Design a protein around this ligand. Structure first.
Ligand SMILES: [Zn+2]
Ligand SMILES: [Zn+2]
Lengths: 66, 139, 47, 17
């Protein structure tokens, strides 16, 4: 549903980097340079933001009220 | 005694539950409300009939355009369901109502009448809504 | 003196449903309605 | 749950309108 707080393999906090990653991709960044800028060096941590699919945006379309 | 008169006093949180319950002209007619005049003065007016205003106003979350035909002895006019006070019948207001009724010629309702009328409210509260009142309520 | 409050569906307005009552919303008409969260103590030893 | 006023919610007046 939502970006994991930590990389499964490493333990590095990647929960505060999904929105920043989306912003850097809002810029004309190539998909790898965004990860490089976010300080993600290991490929295990890079896969966290590469492969993540944000479904919580789709689940929030089902408003309980309003 | 103003304290016994407070039993049949209709506060503001009880009208919200019966904005659409039928038999309204049979349970509220006989009780007394603490209506607002305005500065902190109040008068005890008599619930005489059920009238409806062309002004739809919201009372918190619920809204009601109905009116109430109140009368303080002789001074009678239309009223809305938002100016009623949750405050209980005070001593000064109780004596003022007594003087308004004695000055108007109206008989003071006998205490047994209040005793038999106050239980109407409680039997109306625990009434099971098995008949076709939900449908008219939603309408 | 708790009337077993429910939450409607399409409405999301708390309704007071006692026994022997039809399950409908107090407003707008709705035959689906859910239950409120419990008042029991909810404690997760996060792990 | 009969009358939870706790006073009240600012009762408007009739002479204030
Ligand atoms: Zn990692
Ligand atoms: Zn319904």
């Amino acid at each position: 549903m939502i970006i994991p707080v930590r990389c499964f393999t490493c333990g590095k906090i990647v929960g505060n980097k999904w929105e920043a990653y989306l912003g850097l991709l809002q810029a004309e960044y190539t998909e790898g340079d965004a990860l490089d800028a976010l300080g993600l060096k290991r490929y295990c941590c890079r896969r966290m933001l590469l492969a993540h699919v944000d479904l919580i945006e789709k689940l929030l379309n089902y408003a309980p009220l309003e | 005694l103003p304290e016994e008169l407070n039993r049949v006093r209709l506060s503001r949180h009880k009208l919200e539950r019966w904005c659409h319950m039928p038999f309204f002209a049979k349970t509220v007619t006989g009780c007394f409300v603490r209506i607002g005049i305005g500065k902190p003065v109040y008068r005890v007016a008599e619930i005489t009939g059920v009238v409806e205003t062309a002004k739809v106003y919201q009372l918190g979350g619920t809204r009601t355009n109905k009116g109430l035909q109140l009368r303080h002895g002789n001074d009678q006019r239309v009223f809305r369901l938002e100016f009623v006070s949750n405050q209980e019948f005070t001593e000064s207001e109780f004596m003022k109502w007594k003087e308004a009724m004695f000055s108007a010629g109206m008989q003071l309702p006998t205490l047994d009448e209040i005793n038999k009328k106050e239980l109407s409210i409680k039997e109306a509260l625990n009434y099971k809504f098995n008949d076709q009142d939900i449908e008219e309520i939603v309408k | 003196q708790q009337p077993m409050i429910y939450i409607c569906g399409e409405c999301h307005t708390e309704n007071e449903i006692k026994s022997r009552d039809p399950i409908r919303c107090r407003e707008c008409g709705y035959r689906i309605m859910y239950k409120k969260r419990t008042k029991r103590l909810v404690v997760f030893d996060a792990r | 749950t009969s009358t939870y006023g706790r006073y009240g919610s600012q009762t408007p007046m009739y002479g204030s309108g």
